[PDB]
């Protein structure tokens, strides 16, 4: 009944998520963009209605293309939740401050599959962009990639596939400690059942790592921290810069987050 749930979740994982690892590998083994003028012809062909005005500045152009990916990613993410057993039985409210606080870090934890030490997929895989492009981006956007690669990096090197990391994102979204949550108790048994999972799956699925669990739990934690780090971040930028203007469900999900 567990090995059946580890299922449900990983076959709700593949049926919601637009990329997943094997996709992301199978790809990676795509138009590249290391530098401004194929940063301009990837635009022209992938994103034209961006690039049609006459237009932004090149490092707003792509932070509003990471936003619109963060977007798209908080309805496939939704979608996913409803799998996760007890989720859908939860109060709309108590749903929605899971969803909120933990949306970003699936989104780094997720990320991390279509990343490799040079580079990263974008746009649905059509398009593969270096690592060293985004650190050349002058200050403060390159600030904003960087670091997301430092974590995919350690968390890629844990050689974790599909049926785990569904489980990762659903212990993710599964936590009681959320803020301004009505049913704690619900959701930390809800939880408990997640992480329960989670840990057998480890078990049976990498028996050669027995810290496994262990180290994905730590990564929870480093996300949550990746995460504030994050959203301030997005706050200097959405200050400083005149012209970087926030997606609305976006500025909604970063409201009394951190
Ligand atoms: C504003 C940051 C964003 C979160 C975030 C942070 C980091 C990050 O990759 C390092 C991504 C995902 N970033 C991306 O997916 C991405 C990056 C850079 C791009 C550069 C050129 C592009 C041209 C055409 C299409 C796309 C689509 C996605 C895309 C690009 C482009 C998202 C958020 O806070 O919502």
């Known amino acids: 009944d567990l090995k059946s749930l580890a299922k449900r979740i990983y076959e709700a994982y593949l049926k919601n998520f637009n990329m997943n690892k094997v996709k992301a590998r199978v790809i990676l083994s795509p138009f590249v963009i290391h530098d401004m003028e194929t940063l301009c012809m990837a635009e022209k062909t992938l994103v034209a209605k961006l690039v049609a005005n006459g237009n932004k500045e090149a490092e707003v152009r792509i932070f509003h293309c990471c936003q619109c990916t963060s977007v798209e990613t908080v309805t496939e993410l939704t979608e996913f939740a409803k799998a996760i057993p007890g989720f859908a039985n939860l109060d709309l409210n108590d749903q929605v401050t899971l969803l909120k606080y933990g949306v970003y870090e699936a989104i780094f934890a997720m990320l991390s599959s279509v990343m490799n030490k040079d580079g990263m997929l974008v746009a649905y895989g059509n398009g593969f962009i270096t690592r060293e492009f985004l650190k050349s981006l002058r200050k403060p956007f390159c600030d904003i990639m ?113």
């Open 146 to 258: 960087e670091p997301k690669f430092d974590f995919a990096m350690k968390f890629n090197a844990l050689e974790l596939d599909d049926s785990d990391i569904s489980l990762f994102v659903a212990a993710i979204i599964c936590c009681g400690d959320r803020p301004g949550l009505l049913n704690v108790g619900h959701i930390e048994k809800m939880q408990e059942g997640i992480v329960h999972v989670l840990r057998l799956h480890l078990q049976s699925n990498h028996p050669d790592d027995i810290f496994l669990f262990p180290k994905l739990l730590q990564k929870m934690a480093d996300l949550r921290q990746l995460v504030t780090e994050h959203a301030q971040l997005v706050q200097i930028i959405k200050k400083t810069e005149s012209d970087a203007a926030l997606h609305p469900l976006l500025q909604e999900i970063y409201r009394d987050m951190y």
